Amino acid sequence: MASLTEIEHLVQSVCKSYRETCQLRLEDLLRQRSNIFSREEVTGYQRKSMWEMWERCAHHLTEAIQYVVEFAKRLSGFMELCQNDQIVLLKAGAMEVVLVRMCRAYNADNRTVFFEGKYGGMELFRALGCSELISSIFDFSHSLSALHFSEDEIALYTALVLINAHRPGLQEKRKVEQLQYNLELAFHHHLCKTHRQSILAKLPPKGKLRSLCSQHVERLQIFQHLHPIVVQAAFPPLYKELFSKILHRLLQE
Numbered sequence: 001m002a003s004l005t006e007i008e009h010l011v012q013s014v015c016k017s018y019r020e021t022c023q024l025r026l027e028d029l030l031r032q033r034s035n036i037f038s039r040e041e042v043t044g045y046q047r048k049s050m051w052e053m054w055e056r057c058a059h060h061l062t063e064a065i066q067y068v069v070e071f072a073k074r075l076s077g078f079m080e081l082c083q084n085d086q087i088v089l090l091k092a093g094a095m096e097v098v099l100v101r102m103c104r105a106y107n108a109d110n111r112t113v114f115f116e117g118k119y120g121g122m123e124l125f126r127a128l129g130c131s132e133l134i135s136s137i138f139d140f141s142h143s144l145s146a147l148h149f150s151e152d153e154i155a156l157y158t159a160l161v162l163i164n165a166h167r168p169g170l171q172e173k174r175k176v177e178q179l180q181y182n183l184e185l186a187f188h189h190h191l192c193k194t195h196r197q198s199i200l201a202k203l204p205p206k207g208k209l210r211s212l213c214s215q216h217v218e219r220l221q222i223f224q225h226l227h228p229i230v231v232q233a234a235f236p237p238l239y240k241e242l243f244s245k246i247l248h249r250l251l252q253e
């Protein structure tokens with residue numbers, strides 16, 4: 001059950017939802033590639049206190065996750081699913097969706113990312129005190145950039161990152177399995193029709209996204225043990241909910 005014309009309709013529906021929930025447009029990000037942070041500006045970021053850079057980054061991650069919630073709410077089938085399943089899917093997939101979406105603002109020619117109005121390399125995030133996590137994020141982006149994704153490909157791949165029937169805690173597993181299968185078909189059909197099936201082999205292993213997320217959660221536990229009042233007083237509520245309700249409020253609109 002689901003004919004070719006229904007699969008093609010799902011492709012365009014997913015692409016539209018992705019376009020409408022993008023933080024910034026792709027052309028805006030490309031037109032800013034020459035706006036790079038100077039050595040002085042880079043030094044200023046490195047000289048910020050660890051707690052200040054953590055709070056700035058947790059706020060940026062929170063803002064980006066808010067767009068993933070909107071993308072999920074526009075995805076066919078997501079709002080039909082029970083509240084427990086919606087939250088399980090968003091808690092496990094939101095960081096992963098943001099990590100994949102970040103490749104649009106990543107310039108492989110100089111290994112820089114769009115951050116606070118300009119492009120900057122890994123060295124910009126030195127005050128965080130997590131070089132191994134920063135390296136992993138930059139390597140993941142570099143390896144995604146080698147695939148040269150079109151916007152339609154990121155829309156379909158990120159819908160699949162989110163709609164995963166294997167996430168622990170799902171009460172209606174089969175209902176998510178059908179949704180995932182329809183999106184798998186829509187993604188593969190789009191790759192077939194556009195002569196892009198060669199990327200399937202070169203996509204990152206599902207364990208790579210899982211490793212980046214566990215590194216993020218473990219480094220946050222290190223930060224919170226040393227600065228518990230900072231996390232309580234200045235970290236965004238949605239960020240503590242997901243990584244340390246708000247999600248219920250966002251899902252009811």
Ligand SMILES: C[C@@](O)(CS(C)(=O)=O)C(=O)N[C@@H]1CC[C@@]2(S(=O)(=O)c3ccc(F)cc3)c3ccc(C(F)(C(F)(F)F)C(F)(F)F)nc3CC[C@@H]12
Nearest residue numbers: 023024057058060061064102105114115125133134137216
């Ligand atoms: C492109 C855009 O910048 C948005 S835009 C288009 O410019 O508006 C974006 O999508 N950003 C994403 C949302 C915020 C950001 S970031 O810019 O602050 C950034 C980027 C690369 C890094 F190596 C570290 C941080 C971020 C913030 C905090 C963390 C941490 F897990 C970290 F990895 F840093 F540890 C943590 F723990 F701090 F939360 N990780 C990330 C990785 C994803 C990006």
